[PDB]
């Protein structure tokens, strides 16, 4: 994993995230990108620009 130092279990320099639908090449995907389509009567889920994790439920 280029995003993770396996020795220390710390993110490598420049890396913001190690995995996630809102992580691309160790960087956060931009705020607003649709990362999960709603199955029900809900809006779609979008990256926050500040996490590699795509939202799973609306508050």
């Amino acid at each position: 994993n280029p995003c993770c130092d396996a020795a220390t279990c710390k993110l490598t320099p420049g890396s913001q995230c190690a995995e996630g639908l809102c992580c691309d090449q160790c960087k956060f995907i931009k705020a607003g990108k649709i990362c999960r389509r709603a199955r029900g009567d809900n809006p779609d889920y979008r990256c926050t620009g500040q996490s590699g994790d795509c939202p799973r439920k609306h508050f």
Binding site: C4, A7, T8, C9, L11, E19
Partner: protein, 59 residues
């Protein structure tokens, strides 16, 4: 291989307290008062604090 770290997620493996460090042994903290640095000059030795993997400079 680092048994203490899942490099795909950059998370510690199940059961692990630490991944690296002079106060880490087999992914677990060494006990408080373990000597973690034998001073090479005139300072005091440094000691593990029981709850962290690093080796802090003796106050």
């Amino acid at each position: 291989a680092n048994p203490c770290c899942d490099a795909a997620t950059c998370k510690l493996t199940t059961g692990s307290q630490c991944a690296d460090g002079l106060c880490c042994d087999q992914c677990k903290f060494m006990k408080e008062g373990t000597v973690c640095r034998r001073a090479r000059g005139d300072d005091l030795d440094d000691y593990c604090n029981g709850i962290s993997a690093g080796c802090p400079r003796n106050p």
